[model samples]
Target: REVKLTKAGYERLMQQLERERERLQEATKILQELMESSDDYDDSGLEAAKQEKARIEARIDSLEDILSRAVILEEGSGEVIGLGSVVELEDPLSGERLSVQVVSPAEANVLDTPMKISDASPMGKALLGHRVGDVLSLDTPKGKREFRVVAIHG
Candidate 1:
């Protein structure tokens, strides 16, 4: 079995890669244009234009490096509380039920209402291999917190 990921996550990663590639290509074109246009300009502002071009080039290189490491998760079983499963948990202390969708480190975004948590996160690691009704304790950077698994579904 492989890690579970939503169709949206898969499509987003593909779109991100495509956009980054297009940006890098655009950077190359802009650099060429700047070099050509600078031939008619005076010494004033020429250095600044060159610097701007260099910055764009550097950004393209950085994006290339990131794209090389991009990962798209494949479908897998949701039998246990593991990556790809939508986990529902209740706060042991407050009785609040929180839902999280687990994904790889690259896919994590805290602001995104639905989380794509890293498998290595304190909470992620704690939930690993746990079953429904199991109470798991996580040693977070803030403090130790426990949660009870309410449900697990694909």
Candidate 2:
């Protein structure tokens, strides 16, 4: 599937890819050094290094594949919710406000500042194509909930 990303999201992916590439290089160097050492060493250690190298290479390959199919989203007006839009939602009942960015699944990281949410997520799906001041009714695991779009920033 083609992944949709904003400029920031694309940059973030590139940054992560670079870091992973560096890690793969380091892992390759370690494996080479372990193989070059002539001393009779633990077989388990050698196998572990090989496995680590393989894992890193796999991750690098995955990232490259995703990057190859990435579709960068252009900047849109803050009139409606869309991928890469920073949105503020307010729970009418609880009066709680949450700010999040709608991003690609690969870029979704709830722990990040201005939490990133996957476009495939329940909340993300509900918010898409919605405009500010629109009330959204979502059937969540916690039962029915109501939220209003307080703001949208591109």
Candidate 3:
């Protein structure tokens, strides 16, 4: 089996990996500097830097493995919502529209912006296979709320 992701999701992962690689390099530099400069500095800074480098190194390995298995999704413009679909949700009470992208779990957890939800998120699974104009009544963790599927797009 392979990890499925949207093109956007794949790009985001690549971006994160690129960023983390840079951070890893920077951490190594810091660790090296701390090792040499510790003659004048305290031990606290040195230990923390070492831990930071270790974490970054571990993260980089994790990212590389995930990236290797990922395959970008071929989204269909079907009536029913599916993975990689950009969904517009309308608040039942206020008629306000909230746009979100339904992506893979990996991408969903990567970014904090744009309200990306994973296939495993309760509401995420709830929204999938639903058509535009469908209304959902859910008892969310935050409390009871309702939403209407306004539109589905790329």
Candidate 4:
């Protein structure tokens, strides 16, 4: 599938790709050194290194494939919520606020300090096509929750 990504999401993927490539290279080098070493070595350890190298290489390949088909989205206007928009939402009932960047599923990481929500997510779907000051309700596994769009920043 062709994944849609924002410029930052694309950059993030590139960075991860670079890191995976580096790890693959390091693993390859270690495996080579183990094979070329004449000193007493554990065959099991060598096999583990080989497996690690293969795993890293596979991850790098997957990342490359994703990047190859990625469509980078441009920044959206603050007029309405859309892909690549940084949105600030408020829970009127609890008076809680949240700021999130709407991104692709591949780039979504809610654990990050500043959360990145996938456009495919419930909240993201509800927010899309809506303008600031619009109140939206999302039906999640935890039940329906209402939020007000406080601001939109691209």
Residues 16-83, model 1: lDDT tens digits: 44765676566667656766773755654556656665665564464344334434333442357778
Candidates' lDDT values, in order?
0.58, 0.72, 0.68, 0.71
| Global fold similarity of model 2 (TM-score) | 0.51
**Winner of 3 and 4 under TM-score:** 4
Candidate 3 lDDT over residue span 76-111, tens digit each: 433677788887775533445567778898877424
TM-score of 4: 0.50
- Candidate 2's C-alpha runs over 4 A off are 77-154
Identify the runs in model 1 with alpha carbons over 4 angstroms from their true place: 1-78, 139-143
In the range 17-130, model 2's lDDT, one tens digit per residue, is: 799889988998988888888984577778999999988777677657756776666665247889999987765435566788899999988777677888998877987887
Error (Å) of candidate 2 at residue 65 is 0.8
Off by over 4 Å in 3: 38-41, 77-154
Give per-candidate clash totals.
0, 0, 0, 0
Give the alpha carbon lDDT tens digit for every residue of 28-146 in model 4.
89999899889845698799999999888776776677568766655663477788888876654455667778888899887764468889998778778865555566653346865
Highest lDDT scorer: 2
Q: Give the best candidate by TM-score.
A: 2
Q: Report lDDT (Cα) of residue 104, candidate 1.
A: 80
